[PDB]
Structure 1
Amino acid sequence: NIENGVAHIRSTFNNTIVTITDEFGNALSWSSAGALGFKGSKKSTPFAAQMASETASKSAMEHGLKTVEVTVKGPGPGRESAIRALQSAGLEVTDVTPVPHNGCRPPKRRRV
């Protein structure tokens, strides 16, 4: 039984991943678009992200979690959908996208 928690959202252009934990960082339940049998372009849709945070939150509340914080990441479109649905699963809502200070060289641009 844990009541205070943190919800991590990792939304990219290929997949949305949600991990729920306390403030101590130890996870309790996670889901993703792939865990719901979505493949490819389906795995990145904003609708398909909400089906993942809803699944994740229901498992964390089963442990007894009521208040969870939000840490969002990535430019994936499944950001509002995965965050609003956090408040839509009986969870009380009380940006961590890594930016470098000019560090490592990024890969070459794609000539599609």
Structure 2
Amino acid sequence: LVFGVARIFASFNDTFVHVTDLSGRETICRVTGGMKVKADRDESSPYAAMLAAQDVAARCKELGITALHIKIRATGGNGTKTPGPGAQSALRALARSGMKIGRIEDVTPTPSDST
């Protein structure tokens, strides 16, 4: 088994499923929700993240890593510091279509004092 780390940047507006190696620098594959759903209103849908996670898991098992460390984040500067329906449904679709999950971490940027 090979662990790859997936950053799920789940805003209220769009969702980003991003898969990198343990360094975090070498991008394996990324698929957003806007590139899978036509409506900008529906760009942040659990359906969007479901299709995105299906595409990403298909790609990374066609590569054959089958194991992911998951790091979820949200807009953290002046935003909400809470992830999205993209994050929840994407994680669900991922570990349904395979992808032995290792360590989960909610790494959001939390400012000490912003504005």
> What is the TM-score normalised by the length of structure 2?
0.81
Which residue number in structure 2 is paired with residue 80 of structure 1?
88
Greater helix content: 1
The letter for the 1-side match of 2:67 is T
Aligned to 2:99: 91
Separation in 2 of the partners of 1:44 and 1:37?
Answer: 9
Amino acid at match of 2:29: S
What TM-score comes out, normalization by structure 1 length?
0.83
User: How big is the shift at 1:32?
Assistant: 0.7
Unaligned segments of structure 1, at least 5 residues: 106-112
Q: Displaced runs of 4+ in structure 1, greater than 6 A?
A: none
Does the residue aligned with 1:51 lie in a helix, a strand or coil? Answer: helix
Check whether the contact 2:37–2:48 (CA below 8 A) recurs between aligned residues.
Answer: no
Identity of aligned residues (%): 33
Cα distance between partner residues in 2 of 1:97 and 1:18: 15
One-letter identity of the residue aligned with 2:112:
H
Contact 1:6 1:69 in 2 (8 A): yes
Q: Is the 8 A contact 1:71 1:96 kept in 2?
A: yes
Structure ID, larger Rg? 1
Rounded Cα–Cα distance in structure 1 between residues aligned with 2:7 and 2:57:
11
Give CA-to-partner distance per residue, 1:41-79, whole Å, 9 cap, x none: 110112221111111111111111111110011132212
Match of 1:16 in 2: 15
Distance in 2, Cα, partners of 1:39 & 1:78: 15
Amino acid across the alignment from 1:16? T
Q: Structure 2: which 5+ residue stretches go unaligned?
A: 75-82
Is the contact between residue 34 and residue 44 of structure 2 (CA under 8 Å) also seen in structure 1?
Answer: no
1:4 Cα deviation after fit = 2.0
* Aligned residue pair count: 103
Deviation at 1:38, TM superposition (A): 2.9
Between Structure 1 and Structure 2, the one with more strand by share is 2
CA distance in 2, matches of 1:43, 1:50: 12
